[PDB]
């Protein structure tokens, strides 16, 4: 009748949408693109992931029941069950499209299949449901496009035993946005952990720390631009979070210990540099008139206020293996002072978040069991604001790397599996491997390769670097501007950049100082040699499972963090799930035609289907082509060989048909035009009434 989506009456553009709409309005959410799942997000609890439906899809196949358990899984996730290995699922899409729901679908499908009962196994099924009111507190922030937007890459890992049942899991984060601690547009926030504190502690405790329930009063928080949000109610959320804080195991005693770390950051935030007017003209020294605020930090940091001012304002260098003799120095400009200042407040939080979340699991993470691991991916999605900037460049860059991930896996890796599983396969035309957009920013002579060159040249400002792009390139594909491309739409202070489809114009504000975030010893060394257990805690015993070389900026370190991510993604058994946002009105049962159509277009997912199989009109699976058109040919009866694709050859070679007319491969038979599907039926119709 209507076996899944592959089988359409008309394999065309218009028919593809008409059916897609007919699917959505027929309680058919999940749609198959080619052994790959495409889903959406209801943004709430739907009664379709509960026992009943789970028991429906057990021991059956795809072509037997409606879209829900794409055969590939049953034929791949189970294929490695005899081989005896673990899996890993990757998920992508727009922000808010359920870097969670799509992950939950895996769980609710994963359980039960693992033979149900298990005291330690079903326990996580209960706690992970109580994670929804919890997870939204730590690694989440509000974007103008998404409220529950995670602000850090996450690769969850489900642990199991030598049977198939779950036992526990761990978490791994990444470099994460840099300038979201000090710079942002009026309306957005930085991180919850800060705001949740201010409207939590009693005014009494705040006054003791020289604080006040009002961000505007501060400086660091004032440089952000905004403070209050119209959609979020922090004051009323605190007491609700406290219950969630205790749910894990963070008693008031522990809470107070955590607030000190933030208080330390706030004390750093009340420390600026009253541009010392010691020098009379050009260069300038650094002096602190507001000693009250400066002293407050050193007081809570429990370090010598004097040494702190001398060691930081004046950098030390003289490490001749024997290991250093400090103090020799001389003042420097204000820009560098404010720059080095930020680098301290940026590196402190990075190593904080890492050590913080890792110490939370100490109470949560299962220690009772031990075993392998199955991975799950979740990252921030695509976005476009009124005005783009350096931030969008790095984010959109990740999408290009993400698009490459799929291509490398669902398009390239799978092809190599055909020639490895003893199948007569031939290299079918596939759109460019687009390795040029990658080599243009990795090996010598490249984007971020030239950028690294422009960074360390302290004088080469953002403007000068932008000039190095237009000249070195504007010849290689995927780049334009106002000089080469005659188009007024490109401002003189802006530049055009072509993506995989859409066009985006960026600004060059920040770039360097924002990306660098370099902090050498001299400044760090003063903190590492602290006696307080908290301060030194922010500086773990030297490189935890991340050594290599140490000094080389944090910007270049970002690339390394993302490269180390893909390296471990291309060494396992992938699984593909993509998400799409319903609408911008939070409506139920309403599809935005233009919005959804656009997403499917600029991503080239329909061209993907074509290339995935080979590319043309109507296409049908071999495994399925066989058990369907048998009565047409002779000797294609229970006295068969077994193979499906081989039989197809025997049928077409005996009746003398040009073999180039039909393209042969592993899966998906290729016969041009859909008019032939009738030709098969007719060949069967008027020969046996």
Curated annotation (Swiss-Prot):
GO MF: actin binding; actin filament binding; ATP binding; calmodulin binding; microfilament motor activity; phosphatidylinositol-3,4,5-trisphosphate binding
Region (Disordered): 531-554
Binding site for ATP: 93-100
Gene Ontology biological process terms, A to Z: actin filament organization; actin filament polymerization; actin filament-based movement; chemotaxis to cAMP; endocytosis; phagocytosis; phagocytosis, engulfment
GO-annotated cellular components: actin cytoskeleton; actin wave; cell leading edge; cytoplasm; cytosol; early phagosome; leading edge membrane; macropinocytic cup
Domain of life: Eukaryota
Keyword terms of this UniProt record: Actin-binding, ATP-binding, Calmodulin-binding, Motor protein, Myosin, Nucleotide-binding, Repeat
Keyword ATP-binding assigned: yes
Sequence intervals crossing the membrane: none
Protein's job: Myosin is a protein that binds to actin and has ATPase activity that is activated by actin. May play a role in moving membranes relative to actin.
UniProt subunit comment: Myosin I heavy chain is single-headed. Dimer of a heavy and a light chain. Inability to self-assemble into filaments.
The protein's name in its UniProt record: Myosin IE heavy chain
The organism of origin for this protein: Dictyostelium discoideum
Parent-record interval covered: 9 to 697 of 1005
């Amino acid at each position: 009748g209507v076996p899944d989506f592959v089988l359409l009456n008309q394999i065309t553009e218009n028919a593809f949408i008409e059916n897609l709409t007919m699917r959505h309005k027929s309680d058919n959410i999940y749609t198959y693109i080619g052994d790959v799942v495409i889903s959406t997000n209801p943004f709430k609890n739907l009664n379709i992931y509960k026992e009943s439906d789970i028991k429906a899809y057990n021991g059956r196949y795809k072509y037997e029941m409606p879209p829900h358990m794409y055969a590939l899984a049953n034929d791949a996730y189970r294929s490695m069950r005899q081989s005896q290995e673990n899996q890993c699922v990757i998920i992508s899409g727009e922000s808010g499209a359920g870097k969670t729901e799509a992950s939950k679908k895996i769980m609710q499908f994963l359980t039960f299949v693992s033979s149900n009962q298990s005291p330690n196994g079903e326990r996580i099924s209960k706690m992970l449901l109580d994670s929804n009111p919890l997870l939204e507190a730590f690694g989440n922030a509000k974007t103008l496009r998404n409220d529950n937007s995670s602000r850090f890459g996450k690769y969850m890992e489900m642990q199991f035993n030598a049977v198939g049942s779950p036992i526990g899991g761990k978490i791994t984060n990444y470099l994460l946005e840099k300038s979201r601690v000090v710079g942002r547009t009026q309306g957005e926030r930085s991180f919850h952990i800060f705001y949740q504190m201010l409207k939590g502690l009693s005014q009494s405790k705040l006054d003791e720390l020289g604080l006040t329930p009002n961000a505007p009063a501060y400086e660091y928080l004032k440089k952000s631009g905004c403070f209050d949000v119209s959609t979020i109610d922090d004051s009323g959320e605190f007491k609700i979070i406290v219950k969630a804080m205790e749910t894990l195991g963070l008693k008031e005693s522990d809470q107070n210990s955590i607030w000190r770390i933030l208080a330390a950051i706030l004390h750093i935030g009340n420390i600026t540099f009253a541009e010392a007017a010691e020098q009379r003209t050009g260069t300038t020294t650094v002096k602190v008139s507001d000693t009250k605020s400066l002293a407050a930090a050193a007081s809570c940091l429990k370090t010598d206020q004097q040494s702190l001012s001398i060691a930081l304002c004046y950098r030390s260098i003289s490490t001749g293996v024997g290991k250093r003799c400090e103090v020799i120095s001389v003042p420097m400009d204000c820009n560098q002072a404010a720059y080095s200042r930020d680098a301290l407040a940026k590196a402190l939080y990075e190593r904080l978040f890492n050590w913080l979340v890792s110490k939370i699991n100490t109470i949560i993470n299962c220690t009772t069991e031990k075993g392998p691991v199955i991975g799950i991916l979740d990252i921030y999605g695509f976005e476009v604001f009124q005005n783009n900037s350096f931030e969008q460049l790095n984010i959109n860059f990740c999408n290009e790397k993400l698009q490459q991930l799929f291509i490398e896996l669902t398009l390239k890796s799978e092809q190599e599996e055909y020639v490895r599983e003893g199948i007569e396969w031939k290299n079918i035309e596939y759109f460019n491997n687009k390795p040029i957009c990658e080599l243009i920013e990795k090996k010598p002579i490249g984007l971020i390769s030239l950028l690294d060159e422009a960074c360390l040249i302290a004088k080469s400002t953002d403007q000068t670097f932008l000039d190095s792009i237009c000249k070195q390139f504007e010849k290689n594909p995927h780049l334009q501007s106002y000089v080469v491309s005659k188009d007024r739409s490109i401002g003189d202070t802006c530049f055009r950049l072509k993506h995989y489809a859409g066009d985006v114009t960026y600004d060059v504000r920040g770039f360097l100082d924002k990306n660098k975030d370099t902090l050498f010893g001299d400044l760090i060394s003063s903190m590492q040699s602290s006696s307080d257990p908290l301060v030194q805690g922010l500086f773990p015993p030297t490189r935890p499972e991340d050594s290599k070389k140490r000094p080389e900026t944090a910007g270049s370190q970002f690339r390394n963090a993302m490269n180390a991510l893909i390296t471990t993604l291309l060494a396992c058994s992938p699984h593909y799930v993509r998400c799409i946002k319903s609408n911008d009105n939070k409506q139920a049962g309403v599809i935005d035609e233009d919005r959804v159509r656009h997403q499917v277009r600029y991503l080239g997912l329909l061209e993907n289907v074509r290339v995935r199989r080979a590319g043309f009109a109507g296409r049908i699976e071999y495994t399925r082509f066989y058990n369907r058109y048998k009565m047409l040919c002779k000797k294609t009866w229970p006295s068969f060989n077994g193979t499906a694709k081989q039989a197809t050859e025997l049928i077409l070679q005996q009746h003398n048909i040009d073999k180039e007319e039909i393209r042969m491969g592993k899966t998906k038979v290729f016969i041009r035009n859909p008019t032939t599907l009738f030709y098969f039926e007719e060949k069967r119709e008027l020969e046996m009434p």
